[PDB]
Symmetry: none
Subunit: 26 residues, 10 copies
């Protein structure tokens, strides 16, 4: 993954290869 923003970025998040587990029991 290549990222190169000129100018004025804002909250740049180049997440990559991010396994996610989300389980909720009520």
């Amino acid at each position: 993954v290549l990222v190169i923003p000129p100018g004025v970025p804002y909250w740049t998040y180049n997440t990559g290869d991010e396994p996610v587990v989300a389980i909720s029991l009520l």
Copy 2:
């Protein structure tokens, strides 16, 4: 994945290869 925004970006998220598990029981 290649990302290069000129100008003024805003909340750029170039997520890639992101396995997601979401299970909810009530």
Copy 3:
């Protein structure tokens, strides 16, 4: 992952390879 923002960035987060476990029980 390559990141090079010119100009004025803001809250740049180039997270990579970030295993996430999130389980909640009420």
Copy 4:
């Protein structure tokens, strides 16, 4: 991961390889 922001950055966080465990029980 390569990071080189010119100009004026702000709260730059280039986190990488960050295993996360988050489990909450109420």
Copy 5:
């Protein structure tokens, strides 16, 4: 991880290889 910001940085955090355990019980 390579970091080299010119100009004026602000709260630069290049965290890398940071295992995190966060478990809370109420």
Copy 6:
């Protein structure tokens, strides 16, 4: 605006009253 997500949210953005100006000339 009232927001109260139980469980495990992700990138919640409850933006409100957000004047936006975006003009670009090439």
Copy 7:
């Protein structure tokens, strides 16, 4: 704006009253 997420949130952004100006000339 009222926000109260139980469980394990992620990157919660309850931005409110956010005047935004973004003009770019090339």
Copy 8:
């Protein structure tokens, strides 16, 4: 703005009243 997340949050940003000016010329 009222914020009260139980459990284990992550990068919580309750920005409020945030005038933003972003102008870039190349």
Copy 9:
């Protein structure tokens, strides 16, 4: 702005009233 996170937070940023000027010329 009222903030009271129980448990184990991470990088909590309750920024409020934050005038921002970001102008870049190349």
Copy 10:
């Protein structure tokens, strides 16, 4: 701004009233 995190926080930043000027010329 009222902040009272129980448990184990991490890098808590309750910035308030923060005029920011960021201008860069190359």
